[PDB]
């Protein structure tokens, strides 16, 4: 009667990538069909299954005979990493009615997940004709919504004689009752396709698909969410692992309406307000992306097995991309700072004599639920100077702004809910475009 023991006791299928192969590890290893164009994209720890809108990428599961009848009178749930591209305004007005069933038991009845417009919806097809739906009206705040290309989780906590619920990140976000049904002779085929979609560039990426032969409870599903969230790798914004030597823009976590901006050649950084878009006509609004400064993350000194995957807590440099010329961040000695403990940041300070602390290290310390990333800055003698944080203060003659800092003072707030030195790493990704 413990969390993880019941967790691994109730799972009755586990679709998981293992060395370019998809297979079930739930003991009841059932058929895992695959087709030449069932591509797989970068995954948190490994790879990530993909889908494309045509008859190519079917991944169906002919399940075991004994468990074929699993859904006759039993409650259950689905769970998986999910993300869909940002449906643009144009494609939105184009396809704001299409209702394609990603996961289903069609032919030809039973539980059937469906994605339509900006909605996820359970659809259950029982014997006597009755049907219940549990819509989730879109989270209108796209920039943190649940169909915004954010790697996110979903669970559908079906219960026959009780309610079924949906859970995003574990949190509740919508529900509706189910009772008043009958026995279902549900078929066994488990389609994973963009069935009857109407957009060519539509694609849903399911990861770590699993089913549990019983109901659940909020506490253990939160623990489960955490469990899947391995600390092992150090995710970027979208959820896929960070990439060394690839472009990145960076966004504070309590400054969504902000983003980064260089001031001058080789001198200090600073922050600024939010360029974005707002379709107040289709309840759509989101901070625009890819706009700010481009950043390159290297290893400090090359290695033999140079895989761009970043492990937790690895020593790195930090180069900024500018006119496709590279420039490194840092802090030169005697670098004028705030309170002498909040070290101002710099970029490749072309000092004739003065050296420059160029030795940083990606470090994960907080936010085991949300995909943030803290950056640390050491000296050249292995001493913690602080994290790159948000702390006000004017300098010289120019006006006061928000500047990037380094202050071990931050280390005394790591238990808080909101910090000032947590960060987002957005890479230039397909499934989101500033309309």
């Amino acid at each position: 009667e413990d969390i993880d023991v019941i967790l691994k006791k109730s799972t009755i299928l586990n679709l998981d990538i293992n060395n370019d192969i998809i297979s079930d590890i739930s003991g009841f290893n059932s058929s895992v069909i695959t087709y030449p164009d069932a591509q797989l994209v970068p995954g948190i720890n490994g790879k990530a299954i993909h889908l494309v809108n045509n008859e190519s990428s079917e991944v169906i599961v002919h399940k075991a005979m004994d468990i074929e009848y699993n859904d006759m009178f039993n409650n259950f749930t689905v769970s998986f990493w999910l993300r869909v591209p940002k449906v643009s305004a144009s494609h939105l007005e184009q396809y704001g009615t299409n209702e394609y069933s990603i996961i289903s038991s069609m032919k030809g009845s039973g539980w059937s997940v469906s994605l339509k417009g900006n909605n996820l919806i359970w659809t259950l097809k029982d014997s006597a004709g009755e049907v219940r739906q549990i819509t989730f009206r879109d989270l209108p705040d796209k920039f943190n919504a649940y169909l915004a290309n954010k790697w996110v989780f979903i669970t559908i906590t079906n219960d026959r004689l009780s309610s079924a619920n949906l859970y995003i990140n574990g949190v509740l976000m919508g529900s509706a009752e189910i009772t008043g049904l009958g026995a279902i002779r549900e078929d066994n085929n488990i389609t994973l396709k963009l069935d009857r979609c109407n957009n060519n560039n539509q694609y849903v990426s399911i990861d770590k698909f699993r089913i549990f032969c019983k109901a659940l409870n909020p506490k253990e599903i939160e623990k489960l969410y955490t469990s899947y969230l391995s600390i092992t790798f150090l995710r970027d914004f979208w959820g896929n692992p960070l990439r060394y030597d690839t472009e990145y823009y960076l966004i504070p976590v309590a400054s969504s309406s902000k983003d980064v901006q260089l001031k001058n050649i080789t001198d200090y950084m600073y922050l600024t307000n939010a360029p974005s878009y707002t379709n107040g006509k289709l309840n759509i609004y989101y901070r625009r992306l890819y706009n700010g400064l481009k950043f390159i993350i290297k290893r400090y000194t090359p290695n033999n097995e140079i895989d761009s995957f970043v492990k937790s807590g690895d020593f790195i440099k930090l180069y900024v991309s500018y006119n496709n010329n590279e420039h490194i961040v840092g802090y030169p000695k005697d670098g004028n700072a705030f309170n002498n403990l909040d070290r101002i940041l710099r970029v490749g300070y072309n000092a004739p004599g003065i050296p420059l602390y160029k030795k940083m290290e990606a470090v994960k310390l907080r936010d085991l639920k949300t995909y943030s990333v803290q950056l640390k800055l050491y000296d050249d003698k292995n001493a913690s100077l602080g994290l790159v944080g948000t702390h006000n203060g004017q300098i010289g003659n120019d006006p006061n702004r928000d500047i990037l800092i380094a202050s071990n003072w931050y280390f005394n707030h790591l238990k808080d809910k909101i910090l000032g030195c947590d960060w987002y790493f957005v890479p230039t990704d397909e499934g989101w475009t500033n309309d």
Partner: antibody
Amino acid sequence: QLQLQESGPGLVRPSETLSLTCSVSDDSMGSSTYYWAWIRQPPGKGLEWIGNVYYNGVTYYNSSLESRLTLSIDPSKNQFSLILSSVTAADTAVYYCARQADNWFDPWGQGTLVTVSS
Amino acid sequence: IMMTQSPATLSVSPGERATLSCRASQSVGSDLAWYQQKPGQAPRLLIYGASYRATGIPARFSGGGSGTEFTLTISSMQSEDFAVYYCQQYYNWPPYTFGQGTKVEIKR
């Protein structure tokens, strides 16, 4: 010390072209990372601006005033210019391109008036 | 919404205190700027974040407020330093969509 100093003098006839060059001077580096935007000024009236485009050149402020004017950059002399065509007399004005240094149009220049006469 | 001047008036004499106002929505609850415009030349800024002046600007000006709705005051005015002002917003492609007007007045 950034003395904005613009040119493109004269008057324009309707539906013709206007060249408007925003020569930012004495700032050798100049275009480092901050924006640049334009200002519309119909004499004795409210003030909506025109646009704002970066030297990466993503886009400019597109309310219902684009598709007749266009914004340009030139990191050569830190310069950047304004394209104008298919204009009516309703925009006879004195325009202002100004340094949006760190997202506030702090230093402004002499500028010059444009007369869409006939 | 966007900006609306509530009110849009002014009645002052040499020496007294100016009183202006604005109104808007607050989804970007950003402290903002105020622009003066001497007639003889191009306009310029007076404040930003309603409190922080820029260089060369004597501190006799100020302002404050909450959300994005803001007001400001100016004490000890000299006729030589008087003209219509303007208040901002934060559109998410930001330059700042201007306030309609701040009608001014010299008292005789």
